Amino acid sequence: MNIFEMLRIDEGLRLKIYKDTEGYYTIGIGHLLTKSPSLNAAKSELDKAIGRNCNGVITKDEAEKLFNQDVDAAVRGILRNAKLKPVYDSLDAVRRCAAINMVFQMGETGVAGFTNSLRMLQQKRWDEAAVNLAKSRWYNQTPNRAKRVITTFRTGTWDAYKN
């Protein structure tokens, strides 16, 4: 397992515009298009992202390329962030995947309230971090996915994804 396989499991693959768990237009492997309620706005974002007139539909190759760009953007966002980078660099490779997963799902802004969780992770207080991570809108709104990510932080194994 690696970050691509992990997020492919968590996000699925859909080749036509769909709505994410928050109701926002999305495509591919969890690629957010827009928070606007306008499907036309989402279609414009899609065409800009792919470089052709897509009519709301992409190929698997295009979905996988967007996904690679999105994973890389999450990593670079962590590495450019003075609060996230030191914690990320303190983690082992499996837990770094859990970190990328959260930033992919919520962005840097969405993880801003996780200050106490970040401290517990940097301190390697895994059980305490797991308890703290679950006290979140994130966990309450997407509990099965959050449980998998939290188990990855708690154990440093892929057990939640193999199971």
Selected catalytic residue, list 10, 11, 45, 70: 11
Strand partners of residue 14 = 28
Instruction: Name the residue nearer to ligand CCCCc1cccs1 (CB basis): 26 or 117.
Output: 117
Radius of gyration of the chain (CA): 16
Contacts of 83 (CB under 8 A, 6+ apart): 115, 118
What is the distance between the alpha carbons of residues 107 and 72, in angstroms, rounded to a whole number? 12
Contacts of 80 (CB under 8 A, 6+ apart): none
Contact flag: residue 58 with ligand CCCCc1cccs1 (CB under 6 A): no
Q: Active-site residue 70, yes or no?
A: no
What is the distance between the alpha carbons of residues 35 and 19, in angstroms, rounded to a whole number? 10
Q: Residues 70-109: x/- map of binding to ligand CCCCc1cccs1 (CB under 6 A)?
A: --------x-----x--xx----------x--xx------
What is the distance between the alpha carbons of residues 142 and 5, in angstroms, rounded to a whole number? 19
Contact flag: residue 151 with ligand CCCCc1cccs1 (CB under 6 A): no
Q: Active-site residue 20, yes or no?
A: yes
Query: Pick from 63, 74, 118, 160: which binds ligand CCCCc1cccs1 (CB under 6 A)?
Result: 118
Q: How far is the CB of 69 from ligand CCCCc1cccs1 (least distance, A)?
A: 19
Contact flag: residue 117 with ligand CCCCc1cccs1 (CB under 6 A): yes
- Residue closest to ligand CCCCc1cccs1, measured at CB: 99
The SS3 call for residue 54 is coil
Closest CA to 100 of 131, 78, 128, 123: 78
Selected catalytic residue, list 5, 10, 20, 64: 20
Residues that bind ligand CCCCc1cccs1 (CB under 6 A): 78, 84, 87-88, 99, 102-103, 111, 114, 117-118, 121
Point out the residues that are catalytic.
11, 20
